[PDB]
Design a protein around this ligand. Sequence first.
Ligand SMILES: [Fe+3]
Length: 51
Amino acid sequence: AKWVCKICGYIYDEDAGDPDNGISPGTKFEELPDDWVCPICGAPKSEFEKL
Ligand SMILES: [Fe+3]
């Protein structure tokens, strides 16, 4: 799945993960740590929407 940051337009793609911030490819959004934030704008998880 993909999830968009409603603040900046960054797309969290589960197939890509976010390795530079400790998230390996294939990590589901719901599995992201509670303290993970948008790598671009710093928004909390609450500000993402599933596409
Ligand atoms: Fe963002």
